[PDB]
């Protein structure tokens, strides 16, 4: 993937992370990446108006089931043991999503798809890097990120202000890319 050169130094201001997990599943949802969908023979992006393919079906099923479990954490007045069960199920769904891309790109795997994996990695690098320059635009500074986390310096000393800054950047990136979490 793409690894940013670190702005090495001492940063006295607040530092908050941005976990780029489920990035590849989110991409596969968004651009409809599937074996039945891509016209491999360097591949090309499939048609957007085309029907939602196979891999998106199961990964979106997992994401929606995780979302409904997340709802079940909002409703209080539940047995704590069942709350722990819901948390375990949500975490399992998270890791299964994260490994979705794993099962497709490896010579170690059955479904080794060099072009499909290359397309997914290219899209991931592109979107993370776009987030990088635009968060530069929004008058902050980024110092490190490789497809699984983003280090962000704040230039601020108020924790709540930093948190709401993270919330606003999360919301804007979520409205820029629909299924990314």
């Amino acid at each position: 993937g793409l690894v940013l050169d670190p702005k090495v130094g001492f940063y006295d201001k607040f530092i908050l992370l941005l976990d780029f997990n489920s990035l590849y599943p989110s991409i596969i949802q968004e651009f409809n990446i599937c074996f039945t969908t891509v016209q491999r023979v360097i591949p090309e992006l499939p048609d957007p108006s085309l029907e939602m393919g196979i891999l998106p079906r199961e990964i979106r099923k997992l994401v929606e089931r995780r979302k409904q479990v997340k709802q079940l954490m909002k409703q209080q007045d539940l047995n704590p043991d069942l709350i722990l069960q819901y948390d375990i199920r949500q975490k399992a769904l998270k890791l299964t999503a994260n490994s979705m891309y794993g099962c497709l790109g490896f010579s170690y795997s059955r479904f080794y798809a060099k072009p499909l994996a290359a397309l997914v990695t290219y899209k991931g690098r592109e979107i993370l890097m776009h987030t990088k320059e635009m968060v530069q635009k929004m008058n902050l500074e980024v110092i490190y990120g490789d497809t699984d986390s983003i280090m962000i310096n704040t230039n601020s000393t108020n924790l709540e202000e930093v948190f709401k800054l993270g919330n606003k950047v999360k919301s804007e990136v979520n409205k820029l890319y629909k299924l990314l979490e």
Partner: protein, 168 residues
Amino acid sequence: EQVFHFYWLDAYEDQYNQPGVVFLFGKVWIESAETHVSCCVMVKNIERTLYFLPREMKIDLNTGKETGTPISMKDVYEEFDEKIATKYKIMKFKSKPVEKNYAFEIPDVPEKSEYLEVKYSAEMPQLPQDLKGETFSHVFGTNTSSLELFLMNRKIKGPCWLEVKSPQ
């Protein structure tokens, strides 16, 4: 009729000791001890399954040049049942008309053609993966495992309680 159920944890397959027999392992409830205790279960006659790809225009097997006649599922059926069966020691199988889909990277493969689902018991020797026929281009499922066929054709999604009838 006596029936019982268990929670299956393990699934073992062997290709040479007891080929075609997957020893499913699991965790059974017993009424006599009013608890759960270890159980073994095994299933035989897990037939190997193949999917022959009939061609469209019969080519000469020696050179690949066209022989001037079309190809049908019936055509590949006889071609198999005499020559391939005699060469690789097959005496019984259940050829059926089955339509399946392929959407992977094996080159020159129709997406939704017709497949000759050749279902023969696993005792007969497994066919070579690069088998080619005068009538059929290639066949899938050569070494595809009895364990995965069991898991895949019995709709057993992960570890779930298994109901078994007529326990021999």
